[PDB]
Structure formats: C-alpha cells, structure tokens
C-alpha cells in the first residue's frame, strides 16, 4: 500500500518505467497508467521517464512538475515533454552602427546566429554590414570620413539580446566581447550590474522591439572612446566587413516552484553555471533550420552504456526525438514537417557520431537510413545537424545559396508588372539569400542596357506592408520613368545570390556587374509590359 | 473527515469547482455552497475558482484570503473577485514645464496614458503640449528665448505618479526614460533613493494633488543640466510638440497578509519583478476606455488547452468578465454599462486573437457577435480592445475625434445667451475632444469676419466652479464688449476638433483658420442675442 517511489519524484516506479499519462478529469487532475485503447482517442501523449532521476533531463525541473504543469509558466511548450532539457542560450543581435573619428557613417546591420565545424558548446554570432551605398556621394569609405593614417575612428553601435532557447534568465545578462578578424579583440562590453531586472522569455527581445535599443557606447564619461580602432584595423574591416560576437554562459539564478504556496520564487542558491555542464555532458544535441533557416538547438537525454545510473533512461529512437522536439508528425505514417517530406534533408555527423552510426547501420544490414530511421539507437554525446538539402551553405553553416532551378520556380507568379515596378509575392524564405537585382533592357538586335550599372545600387527591392514584394527602380533611375526604345524589346531581370556577391571594389575598381555569376530571372517584351 | 483540499488553500475542493460564497451570519463569517434561492435575495456574488492553484489568478494572493477580506485593505473592491489578477500598473504624468538656455518659456501641459499597436506588455505614455499663445507678443519661441544655432536650452518639468493598477506599491519607484522623436533619448529619470516612503494606492497621485509635484531637475549638484538639448533637437520638437515616457516594471516589494495575527508586513522575499511574468503569460487582457476615455486595463484568468494544470480553471465566458470586471449589470437582462447598450461599442482583435475567434464563431453559425456574446470561449493570451463606437481614434489609440453630428446634439441646450458670453453645461467627456472655437461676425449681406483669426488664439473657453462652461469673448478681443452692426446680423459660433487642428504655421506661415475643417455649430440672429 505504501507505493515505492525511490527517486522521490511523485510518480511511482512502475508508472515511470512502463508509461503513464496525465489526464484532466472534469476539474481534478490525476495521474494514470497508460491504457492502450481508451486514452488514444483523446490525443494524449504517452510519456516515459527515469525512475531514478529526480529530473530526467537533469535540468532544475522534476519529471513530475514539468508534465503536470507545476512549473514556471514561461517555459516554452516544446520543453514540456519530459525528455528535453530546458535551459537558456543567449546571443547578441546588433542592428545598426554609426562611425566618426576620435561625416558619420550610419549603417544598418544584419546578424545571424552562427555555427561552425569540431563545434563546441559556446554561443557566437556573426554580423554582416550592409554594403549598399545609401548616399550617392559617399564614394570610397576611406574618404567619406576624413580618416588619416595617424587617426582613429570611434564605433557606436546598437545591439539587443535574443533568447532562442527554452528557459528564462532573470537578473544577469552575459558579458560578451567583440572581435575583428581572427584574433583582434576590440572591446568587451561590460556587464552592467543590477540593471536587467526584467525577464527574457524564449523568443523575446531585450529590450523588446518596442523600446529604444541599448546604446553600445555608454554615452557617459566612463571612457572618451572605449572602442579605439587603429587605421590598419579600419582597413581590415573594409576588406572583410564581418565581425564576431562571442559570449560566455554566465547567466543568472534559477526560479523554482514552491509547493507550500505555489509561488515561483528566485532562489539565490542555484546558479545556471552549475547545471549547464551536466546537461551538456549527458545529451545529444540537434541543430535544425526548419522553421526559418535559422539555427534552432534542442537537447535530448540519451543513454550511455558505460554508466549504470544512465542505463535507466528509456531507450530513445531517433524518429520520436524528432517527433517531440520540433513538431514533426505522421498524417499517413510518413515523417513530414509542414508539407516538406523528411527526404529533403541532410544528415551531418561529427566523426565520432559517424563511426557510431556506421556501426548501427552495419548491425542492421541497411543502406538507406531513411527507411530504418525508427531502429537507430541514440547514444550520449552524439551531435546531429539537420539542414535543408536544397540550399548551398558556407563554412559558418549559414544559408548562402541554392540551385538555380528552385530560385526560378520561386518567381513564376507575376502578380503585377508595369512601367513603375513589379509587385511580386515570393515565399518569405527565399528572399534572404538574394542580395539584389540587376535590371537591364535589350534592344531588338541584342544590345544590353543595365539600368543600375552600379554594384551598390542592386538593393532596389523593397517590401510593401501587405507582404507583396515591390521593386522600385525609381531610386536609381533619377526619378525617371522606365523608357523603352521598342515595344518589341525584351526586358530581362537577373538575381544575385549571396554566395556570388562582391563586397568591395575589384582589382581595377570595377563597378560593372561583369565578372559576377548572374542568373536569368525575367524576360518580357516591351508590348507585354 | 478528509474534506480534501489539494491546493491547500482553505476552501475545500468540491466547493471550489462548482461555486461558493461567504455570507455573514449575524457576526460570524463561514463558507457555504451556493444555494440559488436563499442567497440571491441577499445580493451575494457567486464565486468559482481553481481547486489546484494556491492563487487562481496567480497573483500573490491566495484564493481564500482574498474573498474573505483577510488581505491588504487597499486592493480595489472590484479586484476582490478571485478571477481578476490584482497587480500594479504605473505610468508617469508630467504637469508643466519651463524653458530657458543653459525669456523663460513656462507652459502648462496635459498628458494622456497611451497605447499603440502587435501591442506589447510595457507601460508608456505620451504628452501633448498646448500650442496656444498664453502671451500675445510671444510669437516664435526661437526669439522669445534668445536661442542661437550654437546655443543650448535647459529642460525643467514637473511630474507626478499615477497608479491605475489594482495593487499597492511600497518601496521602489520605477525608472523612466524621456524620449523625443523616434529614438533620441533625452533623459532617464533617476531612481531617487530612500525617498518613495509613501504609498501608491490605486487611483491616487504621489504626491497628492495638495502637494508640490516632484521637480524633475534635482536642483542639487548631481548634474548642472542633465537634460541638455542641441539646436537641431529643438527643431524636431517644434514640428511635433509631442513626447514619450517609457517606463519599466521594476517595482518594489510586496505586501502580504499574515494569518496568525493579522499583520500586513512587507516581506523582503517577494518582489513584483518575479511575479509579473507569470501574469503576463497566463491571462487574457481586456482594455476598456469606458469610464473617462482613459485606458483602464484588467487581466482575466482564461484556460489554455495545451496545459493540463491550466485546464483546471473554471471556464470563463466573456459576458461575465465584463460583468465582474467593470460593473456591467442586467436591469432587463440586456448587457449595458450605465445605460449605454453593448451595441454602441467596437470589437477589435489582434491577428492571433482574430483567427481564434473566427473558429469559435463558425461552430455556432452566427455573424453578429452581439448575440452569441455569452457563447464565446476565451483562450489564454487574447488581447481585446473595447472602444466607444462613436468616436474617432488616431494611431496611438487615443481619443481624437468623432462624427460631427454627435457634436451638435451636445450643444442643443442653450442655458442662457447674452452679449457677454455663454454659460453652457456640457457632458464632461466631450469637452476634452475640442481644441478651440472660431468666433465670426456676419454682415447683414453675407460677409464673414472671424475674430480670432490666428492658429494659436483659440483657447477662449473656461470652466466655472460649478462645472458650467463659460465662454469669454473679451479674452482675445480688445477687453471691450460685443458690438453688432445690425440686430438682423446672424451670430455664428464655430468649434474646432482635435483631428482638424494645425500645430505649426503652414508653408507660407498662414495663421488664418481657412484650411481648417469646420463643423457648423451655431447661428443665432441679433434679436436672439
């Protein structure tokens, strides 16, 4: 009658080993053993867990509390499943900069969370500075700022913090250092003290998109120009136009749930820097770019044959991991994510993991992993990266290009065309790997007139408030309507993908789009327009 | 004997799920199951709550403590009901400024708490400064203050704090940053130290209307003029005449009730900054502008399908929410707010919320929400905005105008008319959407002479101490009585609504009320006057 539950985690042993489920009874919640036939019709998920671990994930939330909902209500749903560690991952996002000398270059920046290869448990980002020339007269970066060989420029940027993880941080915000090139550390942004009293829930901004971003330069008297930068440095920057933002994991304290009064209180004893290492040492880490081709990281608890205590965890087959971590489902028993079949994805493995999986496929006598997916055992310390198979990628695992045919197919729907511009509707994901467009007109006898014959100009495609892509050639046409020397002359439009773009003037300071690999994107005659 | 109480909150389970109420028996209070026939004559409200939550609302007050009254006596009455979260909402009100250069522009201001749109959970306000000329000769600020291109002006404002929430704050006072334009942060208001020893009960000012408002500039030696302001900045201000006040949610400690001896002591463990996140992720938010056209926000506990624990809360239909949150009642079984039927109000939904309600409206086969109102299910996180259907609104959801026809009825009651002015009695609410009046004279043959023919000369309407509006003609006249060239000449009075007002001289500095959209408001001949 006692009911033995050694781990002291509320759920009894047999329940944990065999399978249980939470089910709301009219207004009272009770825990029940899985009955195959009567629970299935209501769409309840079959849980499993460890009878010997107070928190199977090893994160600060018990097996019981998570599934019952007795937990900080901010943890994202996807982490409600008993086998996914919920923990924070903070990186910094820089939106725009301004420059001067210890005539102000104010450019908007774009950042992407990065990942490179032997990849380690440390967050880093990579900013890319806009190259298009916002001002006509701002030829030559060296001159627009009266920069001298023995001068120094001051940098003043705007940044915000982004949480793409699964758990909240409370007081602290991590210190993080900017670095140019391979090893030239320009500055480390101080960790302001007792000022980040607000909360960073997953998928939220700090400060939120509705507030002024934190000025990077203090604007106070702490240092006149904390971010000094020698001449050679500025040159290096012009040649690379790319920075790195490395951050450590010194987050704050943890909020735990108290049974006596149901209060979620911030405990001053527990600190994330003690929990994170265990999790990072007992889970397989999977990176997925399905949602928006951005690096989303999830962690699953896997078995390690070598450890007695660890054999207690439920054997976890890959397919289910994918099912519970991201939203994959089986309408007809075929794995798919919002239409896209599983076969459209790549599998990349670290050398260790490679060896292990080669073994697993050897004891099964199979060659196509896509079939035997549900018979593959996951072990501890595997690292898996699943990226869409259709796109080309660079060294920093950022989406950088793609095969032309997909690109062309993405345009076969011309919603409108006039002498004032095009109003297209392209799938929101593609227009982030296209740097810009070169528009040109072709005489009936094979001539070629490129309107924006300047590399910077390319950026001519804006987006209307109704999600319709709109190309405004007017800005670089000197506010002159597009002229056509022949109602029979075809108008050709080409698109340039990121991978094939140029970021600085060429050898002979070429401004023409000649040596650029160009893809044909449009061709309507003059009468058709 | 067991009388099971899982949530451990004093009220037993069965009572909590179906409905209970406390009723005073001669001098002793006890808990009883709702009896339909014996309580209704006594006028008690039927409560419901969650048997598995120490505080169904999730705010720092237990289900049991709150309804019985063993609780801090400052929580506003309407928030005593268990399904209305009680928490603070602080914004800042600035009463008047004065200007000079590091010939003093001293103007009185009026502020309104703002909210704009994808609208997020962060308090901010917006002041609008009157443009009217207090002094005749004070044309052009640039000259009234000897401001030069290379000069600097000093800013000195007066502010007071208003608590429009539902719970008291004790120790701390919020940080708040001043911002002109889109992103030019002029100042962050210091957190005065060991000075907010007073209390902010709901609907109160700190300090009270009887005391000097807190001078913004320290008047001490901290910074001579922290709020410097370059020339170009002053220009931005001149075109927009508007400011923004961004404030965060870093409140103080919490006042809790101790059952053993009834002492309410401020516990140093609980801090509002750990609780707000809970509220913000588990309630549906209802914003209402009914009372005085000021935005009052309330939060209601709604169910969230995805979470077992959350499914326990009593189902909450919209109809009761308005009843229990604001004071709506059923004189004749028809929902109305102080006479005004529900049909005179708009329903606006966030894109998320919109989608959800469309589903709910389909399985009921209805098109007019006003019918199935009591059949609309609330899910967690909808944000709902109920505004008076009769008035026009601007981008920041502030009351800004109305249909002209409505304006006229508000004037059909001429209590008296003479050659010295009108003493009207207008509904206090309309006379906050009228910027000023145009006075004009009409020759017996149809000519038109407008007395106050300057953009900044409209503030001619005062209010008498008995709430009777009194219009003074002699103000912007020559301190002379009213002349009439013909007892047959018609006397017209014009009103100018906010939306149609000008805030700066035009291109060619026009000051005439020519290009102002005017609605006809009055026309009496000389005999009537």
């Amino acid at each position: 009658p006692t009911v033995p539950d050694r781990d002291n985690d509320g759920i009894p042993d047999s329940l944990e080993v065999e399978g249980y489920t939470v089910d709301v009874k009219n207004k009272r919640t009770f825990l029940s053993p899985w009955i195959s036939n009567i629970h299935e019709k209501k769409g309840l998920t079959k849980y499993k867990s460890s009878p010997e671990k107070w928190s199977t994930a090893s994160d600060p939330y018990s097996d019981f509390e998570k599934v019952t909902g007795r937990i900080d209500k901010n943890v994202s749903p996807e982490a409600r499943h008993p086998l996914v560690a919920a923990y924070p991952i903070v990186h910094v996002d820089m939106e725009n900069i301004i420059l001067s000398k210890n005539r102000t270059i104010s450019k908007n920046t774009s950042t992407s969370r990065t990942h490179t290869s032997g990849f380690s448990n440390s967050n880093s980002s990579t900013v890319a500075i806009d190259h298009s020339l916002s001002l006509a007269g701002e030829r030559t970066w060296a001159e627009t700022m009266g920069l001298n060989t023995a001068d120094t420029a001051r940098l003043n940027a705007n940044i915000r913090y982004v949480n793409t993880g699964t758990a909240p941080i409370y007081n602290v915000l991590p210190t993080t250092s900017l670095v140019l090139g391979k090893n030239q550390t320009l500055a480390t942004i101080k960790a302001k003290e007792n000022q980040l009293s607000q909360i960073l829930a997953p998928n939220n901004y700090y400060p939120s998109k509705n507030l002024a971003p934190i000025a990077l330069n203090a604007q106070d008297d702490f240092s006149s120009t904390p971010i000094t930068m020698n001449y050679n440095q500025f040159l290096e920057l012009e040649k690379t136009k790319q920075l790195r933002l490395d951050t450590d994991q010194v987050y704050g304290n943890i909020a735990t749930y108290n049974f006596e009064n149901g209060r979620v209180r911030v405990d001053t004893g527990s600190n994330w820097s003690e929990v994170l290492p265990q999790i990072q040492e007992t889970t397989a880490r999977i990176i997925f770019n399905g949602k928006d081709l951005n690096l989303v990281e999830r962690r699953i608890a896997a078995v390690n044959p070598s450890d007695p205590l660890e054999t207690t965890k439920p054997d976890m087959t890959l397919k289910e991991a994918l099912k519970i971590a991201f939203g994959f489902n089986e309408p007809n028993g075929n794995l798919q994510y919002q239409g896209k079949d599983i076969t459209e994805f790549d599998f990349n493995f670290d050398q260790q993991t490679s060896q292990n999986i080669k073994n697993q496929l050897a004891e099964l006598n199979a060659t196509n992993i896509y079939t035997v997916l549900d018979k593959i055992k996951l072990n501890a310390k595997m690292n898996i990266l699943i990226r869409d198979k259709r796109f080309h990628y660079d060294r920093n695992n950022i989406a950088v290009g793609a095969d032309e045919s997909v690109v062309k197919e993405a345009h076969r729907e011309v919603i409108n065309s006039s002498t004032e511009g095009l109003l297209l509707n392209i799938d929101k994901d593609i227009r982030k790997i296209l740097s810009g467009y070169i528009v040109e007109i072709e005489d009936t006898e094979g001539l070629k007139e490129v309107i924006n014959d300047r590399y910077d100009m390319l950026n001519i495609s804006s987006l209307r408030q109704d999600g319709k892509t709109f190309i405004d050639f007017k800005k670089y046409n000197d506010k002159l309507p597009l002229y056509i020397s022949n109602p029979n002359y075809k108008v050709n439009v080409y698109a340039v993908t990121k991978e094939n773009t140029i970021i600085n003037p060429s050898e002979n300071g070429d401004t023409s789009t000649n040596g650029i690999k160009k893809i044909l994107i449009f061709s309507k005659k003059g009468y058709e327009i | 004997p067991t009388v099971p109480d899982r949530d451990n909150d004093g009220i037993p389970d069965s009572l909590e799920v179906e409905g209970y109420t406390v009723d005073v028996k001669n001098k002793r209070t006890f808990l009883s199951p709702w009896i339909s026939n014996i309580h209704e004559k006594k006028g008690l409200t039927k409560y419901k709550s969650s048997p598995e939550k120490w505080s169904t609302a999730s705010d720092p007050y237990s289900d049991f403590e709150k309804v019985t009254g063993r609780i801090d006596k400052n929580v506003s009455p309407e928030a005593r009901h268990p399904l209305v979260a009680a928490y603070p909402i602080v914004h800042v009100d600035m009463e008047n400024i004065i200007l000079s250069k590091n010939r003093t522009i001293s103007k009185n201001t009026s502020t309104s708490r703002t909210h704009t749109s994808g609208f997020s959970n962060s308090n901010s306000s917006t002041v609008a400064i009157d443009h009217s000329l207090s002094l005749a000769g004070e044309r052009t600020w640039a000259e009234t203050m000897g401001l030069n291109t290379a000069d600097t002006a000093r800013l000195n404002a007066n502010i007071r704090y208003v608590n429009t929430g539902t719970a008291p704050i004790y120790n701390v006072l919020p940080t708040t940053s001043l911002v002109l334009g889109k992103n030019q942060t002029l100042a962050t208001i210091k957190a005065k130290e060991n000075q907010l020893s007073q209390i902010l009960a709901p609907n109160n000012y700190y300090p009270s209307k009887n005391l000097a408002p807190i001078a913004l500039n320290a008047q001490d030696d901290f910074s001579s003029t922290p709020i410097t302001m370059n020339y170009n900045q002053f220009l931005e201000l001149e075109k927009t005449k508007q400011l923004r006040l961004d404030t965060d949610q870093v409140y103080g400690n919490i006042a809790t009730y101790n059952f053993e001896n009834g002492r309410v002591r401020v516990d140093t463990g609980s801090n509002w900054s750990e609780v707000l996140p809970q509220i913000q992720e588990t309630t549906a938010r209802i914003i209402f502008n009914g009372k005085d056209l000021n935005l009052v926000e309330r939060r209601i506990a709604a169910v969230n399908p995805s979470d077992p624990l959350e499914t326990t809360k009593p189902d909450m239909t919209l109809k009761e929410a308005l009843k229990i949150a604001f004071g709506f009642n059923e004189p004749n079984g028809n929902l109305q707010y102080q006479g005004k039927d529900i049909t005179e109000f708009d329903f606006n939904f966030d894109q998320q919320t919109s989608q959800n309600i469309k589903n709910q409206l389909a399985e009921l086969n209805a098109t007019n929400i006003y019918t199935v109102l009591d059949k609309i299910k609330l899910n967690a996180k909808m944000n709902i905005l109920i505004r008076d259907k009769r008035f026009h609104y601007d981008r920041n959801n502030i009351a800004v105008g109305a249909d002209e026809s409505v304006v006229k009825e508000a004037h059909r009651e001429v209590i008296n008319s003479s050659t010295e002015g009108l003493l009207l009695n207008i509904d206090k609410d309309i006379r906050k959407i009228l910027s000023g009046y145009i006075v004009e004279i009409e020759d017996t043959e149809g000519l038109k002479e407008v007395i106050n023919d300057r953009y900044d000369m409209l503030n001619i309407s005062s209010l008498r101490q008995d709430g009777k509006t009194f219009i003074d003609f002699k103000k912007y006249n020559d301190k002379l009585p009213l002349y009439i060239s013909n007892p047959n000449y018609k006397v017209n009075v014009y009103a100018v609504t906010k939306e149609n007002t000008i805030i700066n001289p035009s291109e060619n500095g026009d000051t005439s009320t020519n290009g102002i959209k005017k609605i006809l408001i009055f026309s009496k001949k000389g005999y009537e006057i």
């Binding site: - | 001669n26 199951p33 009896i35 339909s36 026939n37 014996i38």
Partner: protein, 699 residues
C-alpha cells in the same frame, strides 16, 4: 462498470441506519441503469404529465434530463441513472439523497403516521424565529403565505407540503459538506435531524416489522426455544405460584363470617352502614353483602374490619411497601404468608435473558394514567373529544419526567396488542443482557424486581385514530438511579438551610421513593416550597422550622402508602391505628408526610395538600408556647371550642368534621393566592379572622 458500480456503492454507503432494510421490507428495489429517458421495463409505466419534477432548488423539470427518479407507489422502485462522478460532484449527489429521503418520508413514515406533532412544533418554531432566513430555506411560497401557526389539522390536510419540507432537511444532513450550513440557519432543525438519524431511527424500523404478523410470530418463536430447558424444568409449585400471580385472589365471605363469631357480628347487624367516610365504595359492597346475611364506638370496630377484608393481591403490596417486606402494616400471619411466597418467587426467576442469539429487543406494556397521577389523569384527556389530548396539560407532564424505578414485578408482553379504553400509555422497554427474568407460556414476561429506568423521550403519537403517549426506556441498575436521589437530597437541603438559618447539616427534606413517577416528584419539591415561602410571613417559618428541628422530625415525600414508610407505624403502636390519605402529621415525631401519587378528592393542587399538613404542625406549636410542661393543642381551650360551634359551618363541609382539621382549612384560605378567597373567609367567619392573628403574634 466496476467503478460506476463502486461509485454507486459508495453513495449508498453514506446512508445512516441502512434504511434499505425497511426499504426491502416494503418490496422496494434498486436498479442501476443508463439513459432514464430510455428507461426500463420496471419503469416507463407512468410516462404522463407528472414528468415535470422540481429539484432541490425547484427550477428544472424534464423526465430525461434529471438522473434520479423513484417509482412513487405500490412498492416503489427508484432509478438513479448510474454514472461515475457521484463521488465528487456534490451538486449531483444531493439530488440522489433528496429523492431517497423523499420516498422514506412519503412511503415509510407516512405508513405509520409519524411525523405527528413532534415535527410540527419545530415547524412552528421556524416561522416564528427571529431571523427570516431559515424559513426561506425549507419551504416554498405556498407555506410562506400561512398567516398563523401550524396546527395538526393543517399537516394532515396537505401532507404534500410537509413531505417536501421534511425531505429537504434529511438531504442536507447526510451530505457531509452541507451539514455545517444546516446548523447555521436552522439550529433546532439540525438538532431534530441530529437526534433522529442516530437513535430513534433504529427504534423506528422495528415498528415497521411489527405490523407483519409473520414477523411477530418469528420473534415469538425465536424466544420459545431459548426457554425450552427452563420451561421443561418448571415444577408444579412454580406454575401454581405463577398461576396465582396472574389472577388477583378474591376473599371468600364465608371464611370471614366464620372467623368472627362474637357479639360484634350481632353489633354489626344494626349499624348505619352508609355513614362511614373511612370505608370506601368498593369496601361498602363487601359490607353490604355481609349486612344482608346479618358515629360511636362502633366505627372503631369497623377500623379493624377494614384491615381484614382486603383482597389477596401480591403485586399490590409490593408498590405500597416499596420493597420493605417487613412492614408491620398487616396481620403477622398474613405477613408471613406474603413473605414466603415472594421469596419463593424470587428464586423462580433464576434464568437470565442473556444470549448470543439476539440483540436489542423492545417490549411493550399498556398502563392507565390514573395509576400514576389521578391529578394529571383527571384532565389529561380532552374534555370534548376523548380521542385527542390537551397539549397544555401535556406540557407539564413531560417537563420533568426523566427516570423511573420499578420495585414490583413487571408483567410485560412481547407483541403490541390493542389496549383497553383506560390504557393510554405505550411503553418501549429495552433490556440489558444481565437482567434476570422469567418467561411465560401465555406470551408475557416476568421481570425481576428492583429495576431502574431512565426516560429518554416523551412524545405524542397517533394510532388508529386515537391518541397515546409514546415512552421509550432502557433498563439500568437501580443503584445508578439511587445515586441521583441522594445527590438530589443534598442539593435541596443545602439550599434551604441557608434560606432558613439552620445548621448546615440537618436532614430535613429526606425523601425515599421507589415508584414509577419518582423523577417528577423530586423536581416538584423545587416548586412547592417556592410557593410555600413567598406566601407566608417570614418570621413564622423560621420560628416554626425551629420547633421542628428542635426534634428529629423531618419532612418526608414519598410514593408509597403512608402507613408503610417508617415513622408512622412505630409511634401509633396499634395495628388498627393506621391512616392513609393525601397528607399526614405526626405530633409525636414532628414530621410532615406528603404522598405525591394520590389525588385529593377536594384539594386543587399539591401545594394546598402541603399547607394543610403544615397547618396541623403549626397549630401544635402555638399551644406548646403557652405551657411547656403540658402537651396540648390550641383546641380544648374554652376560648376556641365555642368558636367552632358558631362559625364552624360557614365554609366547606370538610372543615366541619372537627376542630383540628377546621383550623387547617381556614389557614390555607386566609393565605390563599386568590385575594378573593381571603376576602371570602373574612365575610364568612369574621371572628376567626381576628383570633388567628393572635396566635401568630407570639413571636
């Protein structure tokens, strides 16, 4: 299923005294079904307009909707629409209890006419309670409109309304969570249900079985086998003795006539028979029979004769003597005759009732109210309609009726039988396994003597259009009651010692009582003396009390015949000097004796009986103060004898008897509570009025 059946199982488990047992007895059945719309062959026979039902709150009405319903007649069966949420859903459970309580009151209790009056007064107390909350809770508007208080006719005329109010209360009490609610708004009602559902309900069940003759026979049969060995071992002397006990033994005239044989018989021949107050009516018939065959010193010879013509009635001596068998109140030979038979009978009841074969058994006995108190018995029955009882006199009777003791041999029945006209009491006696008793073949039982009984309740019940008094009882050791009497003795004596000024420890109001109406007698002392004190001049009491205390005399209140107490017999010394009446005064012992049980053929109440005896003692002291050496009364002084010759006949004929009693009648009258009476004696005996004031002057 398993849980649903278990769910129902738990519901029925809360029912208090397993009301299923009477329910099955009336042929009721319990069915767990689904879809009561779609109901069952057992039901569906009444699909009519009556399909509209009102829940506890009175709102809904739909045969399909509501889950609980009962057949409502002719061995009704109830359908509950079985489900699984009944355990936790109170609002769903209340209706289950509400209808189950409704069939009990409408079909069960109605079959035996209870509730009757006992519930009615609760009702009256509800519409007349200070706060108007409670009424609203237990009855609809139809009842609310009643302008006056609820009488028995109203309950019998509607009966639908009462069943409704009753059922609701039953329901609220069984549901654990609402019990507290009940106590707050209807305290008395809670009290009623509280005592109802936990002791009388078991008592109530048996009477239901008591109507089926077969059941009665089974109980009777079950008693037979237990007594087979004892019965088989009965001797002739026991049965012969037992035979005598059942039937009263009549004296034979021929034996007595042959027993006198002297001149007294001739003397008796010519005597004015119809002129003796001492003789009673029944004794005159005996004398009249003898007279056919055959105010001076001849009435003294009649006193002896009275002590010899009484019938041989064993049971009767026993109450008269209170268990003191050695009383020298009768001839020694007769005394020897009685003592042997009872002691022999005492040995006969050697078999104890105690067994493992049976639990709580209740027995009944019909008894005449005039046997306990002819004073109450004289006005107990409604003057106009003998089938109803006047509540006003009833209220006095129940007041202090709390426990009783039986010193004689109880003759009890086994099954209730119709009573004779003069039997209005219906006793329900519980027994203890330790009580010694004898069994009778004629369907009666003989209990051992010296049994103690505590009264648990006093109520009016209805049966076959005639009114009765229902009295329950539990047998207990007499000693437990005896302890109450001494502690009661001390409470009363200590109080009056302070009020009078006497030494703390005097034994003055000592009373020894062993009869059926004991408890009221004791409490009635706390009232006779209060009226006694407030009405007499303070200095007279102290002075007179001093006289009594100066000797060992004590007041003695009893429930046995005066000639048998202790003091009376010893000093008189003559056997024939015995006297019995409502009161008596012994000058020699200076004691006042008050026999409660009898009723003064003249006196209006008990206090007057006391005052009369009080007169006799006081009259003695006045004469004592005149001269100490001589023992004499106030009369025999030439200044009073004459006064009796003139005014002696201007008042009641009873006082005209002689001088001694004459003083006593006037004494109460001059101090009567009705000033008119005082005025009356003034204008009827003016001389005495100044005379009496002269003896009391001596102070």
């Amino acid at each position: 299923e398993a849980v649903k059946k278990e769910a129902a199982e738990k519901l029925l488990e809360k029912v208090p005294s397993d009301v299923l047992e009477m329910y099955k007895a009336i042929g009721g059945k319990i069915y767990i079904v689904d879809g009561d719309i779609t109901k069952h062959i057992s039901l569906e026979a009444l699909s009519e307009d009556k399909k509209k039902i009102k829940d506890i709150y009175g709102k809904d009405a739909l045969l399909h909707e509501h889950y609980v319903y009962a057949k409502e007649g002719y061995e009704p069966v109830l359908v509950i629409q079985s489900s699984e949420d009944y355990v936790e859903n109170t609002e769903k459970a209340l209706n289950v209890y509400y209808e189950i309580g409704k069939i009990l009151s409408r079909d069960i209790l109605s079959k035996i006419n209870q509730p009757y009056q006992k519930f009615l007064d609760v009702l009256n107390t509800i519409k007349n309670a200070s706060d108007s909350d409670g009424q609203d809770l237990l009855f609809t508007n139809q009842l609310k409109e009643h302008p006056t208080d609820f009488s028995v006719e109203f309950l019998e005329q509607n009966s639908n309304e009462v069943q409704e109010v009753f059922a609701k209360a039953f329901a609220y009490y069984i549901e654990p969570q609402h019990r507290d609610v009940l106590q707050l708004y209807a305290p008395e009602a809670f009290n009623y249900m509280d005592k109802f559902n936990e002791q009388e309900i078991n008592l109530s069940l048996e009477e239901l079985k008591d109507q089926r003759m077969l059941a009665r026979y089974e109980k009777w049969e079950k008693i037979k086998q237990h007594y087979q060995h004892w019965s088989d071992s009965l001797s002739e002397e026991g049965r012969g003795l037992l035979k005598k006990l059942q039937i009263p033994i009549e004296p034979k005239k021929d034996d007595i006539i042959h027993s006198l044989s002297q001149e007294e018989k001739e003397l008796l021949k010519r005597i004015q028979i119809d002129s003796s107050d001492f003789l009673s009516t029944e004794e005159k018939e005996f004398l009249k029979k003898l007279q056919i065959d055959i105010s001076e010193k001849e009435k003294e010879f009649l006193k002896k004769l009275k002590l010899d013509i009484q019938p041989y009635d064993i049971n009767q001596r026993l109450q008269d003597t209170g268990g003191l068998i050695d009383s020298p109140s009768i001839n020694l030979d007769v005394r020897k005759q009685y003592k042997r038979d009872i002691q022999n009978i005492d040995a006969l009841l050697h078999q104890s009732i105690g067994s493992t074969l049976y639990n709580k058994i209740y027995l009944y006995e019909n008894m005449n109210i005039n046997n306990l108190t002819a004073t109450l018995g004289a006005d107990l029955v409604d003057s106009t309609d003998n089938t109803k009882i006047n509540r006003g006199i009833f209220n006095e009777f129940k007041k202090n009726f709390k426990y009783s003791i039986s010193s004689n041999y109880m003759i009890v029945d086994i099954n209730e039988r119709p009573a004779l006209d003069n039997e209005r009491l219906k006793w329900r006696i519980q027994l203890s396994p330790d009580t010694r008793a004898g069994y009778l073949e004629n369907g009666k039982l003989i209990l051992q003597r010296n049994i103690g009984l505590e009264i648990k309740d006093v109520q009016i019940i209805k049966q076959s259009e005639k009114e009765y008094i229902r009295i329950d009882a539990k047998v207990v050791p007499k000693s437990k009651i005896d302890t109450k009497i001494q502690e009661a003795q001390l409470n009363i004596n200590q109080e009056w010692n302070k009020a009078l000024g006497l030494p703390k420890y005097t034994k003055l109001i000592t009373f020894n009582v062993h009869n059926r109406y004991a408890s009221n007698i004791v409490e009635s002392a706390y009232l006779i003396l209060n009226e006694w004190k407030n009405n007499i001049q303070s200095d007279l009491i102290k002075k007179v009390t001093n006289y009594l205390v100066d000797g060992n005399g004590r007041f003695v209140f009893t429930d046995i015949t005066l000639p048998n107490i202790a003091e009376q017999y010893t000093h008189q010394d003559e056997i024939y000097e015995q006297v019995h009446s409502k009161g008596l005064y012994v000058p020699e012992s200076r004691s006042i004796l008050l026999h409660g049980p009898s009723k003064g053929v003249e006196l209006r109440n008990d206090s007057e009986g006391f005052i009369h005896e009080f007169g006799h003692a006081v009259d003695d002291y006045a004469g004592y103060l005149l001269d100490k050496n001589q023992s004499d009364l106030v009369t025999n002084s030439k200044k009073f004898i004459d006064i009796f010759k003139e005014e002696g006949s201007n008042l009641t004929s009873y006082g005209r008897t002689n001088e001694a009693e004459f003083f006593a009648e006037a004494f109460r009258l001059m101090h009567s509570t009705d000033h008119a009476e005082r005025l009356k004696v003034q204008k009827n005996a003016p001389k005495t009025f100044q005379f009496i004031n002269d003896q009391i002057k001596f102070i």
